[PDB]
Amino acid sequence: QVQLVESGGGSVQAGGSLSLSCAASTYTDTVGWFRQAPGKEREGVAAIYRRTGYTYSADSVKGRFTLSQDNNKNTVYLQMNSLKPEDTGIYYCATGNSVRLASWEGYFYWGQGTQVTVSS
Amino acid sequence: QYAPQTQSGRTSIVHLFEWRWVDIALECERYLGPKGFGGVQVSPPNENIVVTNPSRPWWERYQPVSYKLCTRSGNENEFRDMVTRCNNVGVRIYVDAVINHMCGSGAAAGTGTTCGSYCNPGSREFPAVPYSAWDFNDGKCKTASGGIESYNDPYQVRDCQLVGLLDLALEKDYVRSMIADYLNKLIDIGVAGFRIDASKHMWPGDIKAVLDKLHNLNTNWFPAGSRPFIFQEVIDLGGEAIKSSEYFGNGRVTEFKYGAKLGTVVRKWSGEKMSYLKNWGEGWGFMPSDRALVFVDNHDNQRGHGAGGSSILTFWDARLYKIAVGFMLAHPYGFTRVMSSYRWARNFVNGEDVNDWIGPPNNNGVIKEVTINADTTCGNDWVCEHRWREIRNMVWFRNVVDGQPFANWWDNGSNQVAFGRGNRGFIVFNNDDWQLSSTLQTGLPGGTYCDVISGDKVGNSCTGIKVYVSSDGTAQFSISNSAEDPFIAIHAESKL
Ligand SMILES: [Ca+2]
Ligand SMILES: [Cl-]
């Protein structure tokens, strides 16, 4: 029994920003964002451990992307700044329970994904 | 540090997970003391951050905000009353010491704490201790995230934040002394020892430095010069960077290989058979018995994705659980800890329980009292596995055979096994899909013995199955695979 609703994303000009949202129907310890760029394997972007707010970000987007969790709801937010063409792709929210965030393991449910396209 | 410090003849501790101090105090008198339990591992007694997202999970107690003895389990005077009352009936108290860290880095600053203390996690301020930013490892951790990224680098595993848990600078004498002051307050109250939480995340030497500052146990209950029992939580299933042996100098270590392997065996998964337990213990690659704290499940892994994963047996699989706990309680390896749990509504998603966060039974956040039914079971969603006849009598079995060697092993090359403990106890298991029907050497004096799994000895009678041991020690055993509890145990104190 778990549903995920991904919001945000869409088209934006290079250097622009977008804020993705992942609203879950229930609490889970780990929530991560992954993306699948045109012709390439899925890649971990950022993950947050919900018991504390601890976050881990892939080198490819650290400093530009910031993941946070709502203080009251089972929802996480991914603020994406300084976007670039290499960031275009389908972003997926996933729920897990791993305490080893840098390994990207332990996810057990995946969202349908949201398209992010960076122009220019 | 390795001696349990339980009274002589008492060989197990029970984890009364999330129980309130007033309930434990009474439980010691009405049950644990008379039934021969050695002690109780209590949940963290120090103040923690209040987690509301989700609503009051059990894990909020692993996020300290001070060392004040004020939690959902009760206040300091109730804690004192519990330690005094339990020690007075021969049951020790072991405190779950959360000393590697304070609360999560993202917790909001304010007084949303169990005793109303203020804290500012964002800037690492815990004035109720008091600790400041320089009392933490942020300046020592070299990872970009500030958390543990590679569990193979001994430095970041010890110096960085365990998933955002603010990491205390355990090398500082100030920090070491603040922790020791807390532990000593507890020892002076009458606590017999400690579970050192998250030990893998502290340097063995920093732990030693803290332990060396500790007082001898309270002489109102212990002989002079007694050292607190120490069991360190370290999960090491083999082939990893940090080994549990790095902590042997400080006291015992939790042997998580134990329940993982036993669970796999009792579930008959991946080709494992109970007959393979003949060389259980060091023969299976486990740490030395005299350094091990063993258990079938613990509060974390009984939720399904801890050390051992789905192989771990719990109260949810009662029949198999009793056989695993029974084998553990009968076997001489390690010092045994029995689990006592509460029920919750599980929600499995692709095999994972997402409702594993649910805290103890409560009414708007206030933990419910443990009610005792006439049949000795508990109400209010407390499972009370430690009161199950099959576990309770095996705790007594272990006391009775204490000090006796492993002897008279037998197996059917499959899942029917048996063994004894010197001339004081014998146990037989049938975990095969057919009848057990064999005459075995029990090693016990001839006579009629009450099987303590199906019943009890009361005066000169048995309430359950009777086992007749002939003059040469052999006895006939017949256990159907359809039996409620497919195992029999007899001992020197169940003989008529
Ligand atoms: Ca540490
Ligand atoms: Cl443990």
Task: Report in angstroms the alpha-carbon separations of B218 from A21, B40, B54, B75, B211.
Answer: 56, 17, 40, 21, 16
B345 touches chain A (CB under 8 A): no
Peptide bond into B130 cis (omega under 30): yes
CA distance B182 to B215: 11
CA distance B449 to B488: 11
Our count of domains for chain A comes to 1
Q: Give the residue from chain B lying closest to A51, CA to CA.
A: B104
Q: Which domains does chain B have, with CATH numbers?
A: 1-403 (3.20.20.80), 404-496 (2.60.40.1180)
Residue with tokens 């009848």: B435
CA distance B196 to B194: 6
User: How many alpha carbons fall within 13 Å on the CB side of residue B174?
Assistant: 10
Q: Phi first, then psi: what are they for B43, rounded to 5°?
A: -70, 160
Q: Is the dihedral of CA B291, B295, B300, B304 positive or negative?
A: positive
Q: Phi first, then psi: what are they for A97, rounded to 5°?
A: -145, 20
Q: What is the 3-state secondary structure (H, E, C) of B425-475?
A: EEEEEECCCCCEEEEEECCCCCEEEECCCCCCEECCEECCCEEEECCCCEE
CA distance B272 to B320: 15
Is B376 within 8 Å of B19 (Cβ atoms)?
no
Measured between its terminal Cα atoms, the distance across chain B in Å is 39
Parent domain of A102: 1-120
Is B53 within 8 Å of A26 (Cβ atoms)?
no
**What is the b/e burial string over B134-144, where b = at least 16 CB atoms within 10 angstroms of the residue's CB?**
ebbbbeebebe
Question: From the CB of residue B470, how many other CB atoms can be counted at a distance below 10 Å?
Answer: 12
CA distance B165 to B51: 14
Structure tokens at B368: 């419910």
Q: Which of B60, B96, B159, B197 is catalytic?
A: B197
Chain breaks in chain B (C to N over 2.5 A) after: none
Question: From the CB of residue B283, how many other CB atoms can be counted at a distance below 10 Å?
Answer: 11
In chain A, % helix, strand, coil (3-state, to 5) comes to 5, 50, 40
Residue with tokens 């213990």: B281
- Pairing outcome for strands B229-232 and B252-254: parallel
Is B183 within 8 Å of B214 (Cβ atoms)?
yes
A 20-49 residues inside an 8 A Cβ radius of B: 26-29, 49
Structure tokens at B475: 């006895």
Contacts within 8 Å (CB) and 24+ apart, B309-313: B309/B260, B310/B351, B311/B260, B311/B263, B311/B264, B311/B267, B311/B269, B312/B259, B312/B260, B312/B263, B313/B259, B313/B262, B313/B263, B313/B266, B313/B267
If we measure between CA atoms, which residue out of A30, A29, A35 comes closest to residue A6? A35
* 3-class secondary-structure state, position B271: coil
Q: Letter for the amino acid at B192?
A: A
Q: Letter for the amino acid at B265?
A: V
User: How many alpha carbons fall within 13 Å on the CB side of residue B345?
Assistant: 2
- Pairing outcome for strands B335-340 and B12-16: parallel
Cross-strand bridge partners of residue B252: B231
Task: Report in angstroms the alpha-carbon separations of B360 from B85, B289, B381, B410, B411.
Answer: 24, 33, 8, 42, 41
DSSP designation for B80: H
- Helix segments in B75-198, DSSP class H: 76-88, 154-159, 173-189
Is A35 within 8 Å of A84 (Cβ atoms)?
no
CA distance B226 to B5: 8
Binding-site residue positions of B: 100, 158, 167, 195, 201, 298, 337
Torsion of Cα atoms, B489 then B490 then B491 then B494, to 10°: 130
* 3-class secondary-structure state, position A103: helix
The verdict on a CB contact (< 8 Å) between A101 and B147 is yes
Is B320 within 8 Å of B259 (Cβ atoms)?
no
Is A47 within 8 Å of A32 (Cβ atoms)?
yes
Task: Report in angstroms the alpha-carbon separations of B48 from B18, B64, B192, B198.
Answer: 13, 4, 22, 16
Residue B433 Cα to chain centre, angstroms: 31
Angle, alpha carbons A21-A23-A27 (nearest 5°)? 135
Rg of chain B taking only CA atoms, in angstroms: 23
B347 touches chain A (CB under 8 A): yes
- Helix segments in B49-140, DSSP class H: 76-88
* 3-class secondary-structure state, position B184: helix
Which ligand is located closest to the Cα atom of residue B101?
A: 1
If we measure between CA atoms, which residue out of B464, B405, B411 comes closest to residue B436? B411
CA distance B135 to B179: 12
CA distance A55 to B449: 60
CA distance B67 to B62: 12
Angle, alpha carbons A63-A64-A65 (nearest 5°)? 100
CA distance B169 to B187: 23
The verdict on a CB contact (< 8 Å) between A51 and B51 is yes
B70 touches chain A (CB under 8 A): no
Residue A31 Cα to chain centre, angstroms: 8
Cross-strand bridge partners of residue B462: B457
User: How many alpha carbons fall within 13 Å on the CB side of residue B496?
Assistant: 18
How buried is residue B67: exposed, middle or buried, by Cβ count under 10 Å (0-12/13-18/19+)? buried
Helix (H) or strand (E) holding B285: none
Residue with tokens 């003949």: B278
For residue A89, the domain's CATH number is 2.60.40.10
Residues in chain A within 8 Å Cβ distance of B350: 108-109
Residue B292 Cα to chain centre, angstroms: 12
Q: Is the dihedral of CA B15, B21, B26, B28 positive or negative?
A: positive
CA distance B95 to B217: 14
Q: What is the 3-state secondary structure (H, E, C) of B328-374?
A: HHHCCCCEEEEEECECCCCCEECCEECCCCCCCCEECCEECCCCECC
Beta-carbon contacts of residue B15 (< 8 Å; ≥ 6 apart)? B40, B41, B295, B298, B299, B337, B338, B339, B340
Tell me the nearest-neighbour CA distance from A39 into chain B, angstroms: 28
Q: B389-401 and B318-330 are packed helices; what angle lies between their axes, rounded to 10 degrees?
A: 10
Q: Phi first, then psi: what are they for B125, rounded to 5°?
A: -105, 120
The verdict on a CB contact (< 8 Å) between B165 and A109 is no
If we measure between CA atoms, which residue out of B362, B269, B252 comes closest to residue B308? B269
Is B295 within 8 Å of B17 (Cβ atoms)?
no
Q: Phi first, then psi: what are they for A29, rounded to 5°?
A: -70, -35
Question: From the CB of residue B458, how many other CB atoms can be counted at a distance below 10 Å?
Answer: 9
Is A119 within 8 Å of B378 (Cβ atoms)?
no
Residue with tokens 């920003």: A17
- Pairing outcome for strands A43-49 and A107-110: unpaired
Q: Letter for the amino acid at B280?
A: W
Residue with tokens 């051992």: B308
Between A50, A53, A71, which is nearest B105 by CB? A53
The verdict on a CB contact (< 8 Å) between A102 and B149 is yes
Is B26 within 8 Å of B34 (Cβ atoms)?
no
Q: B318-330 and B256-266 are packed helices; what angle lies between their axes, rounded to 10 degrees?
A: 130
Task: Report in angstroms the alpha-carbon separations of B410 from B37, B258, B271, B420.
Answer: 29, 21, 20, 10
CA distance B432 to B416: 6
- Pairing outcome for strands B362-363 and A4-7: unpaired
Q: Letter for the amino acid at A28?
A: T
Q: What is the 3-state secondary structure (H, E, C) of B244-256?
A: HHHHCCCCEEECH
A97 touches chain B (CB under 8 A): yes
Q: Is the dihedral of CA B345, B347, B351, B352 positive or negative?
A: negative
Binding-site residue positions of B for chloride: 195, 298, 337
Cross-strand bridge partners of residue A30: A49, A96
**B149 has catalytic annotation:** no
Question: From the CB of residue B153, how many other CB atoms can be counted at a distance below 10 Å?
Answer: 16
Cross-strand bridge partners of residue B490: B426
Measured between its terminal Cα atoms, the distance across chain A in Å is 41
Structure tokens at B203: 């340097």
Q: Give the residue from chain A lying closest to B121, CA to CA.
A: A52
Structure tokens at B295: 């258990």
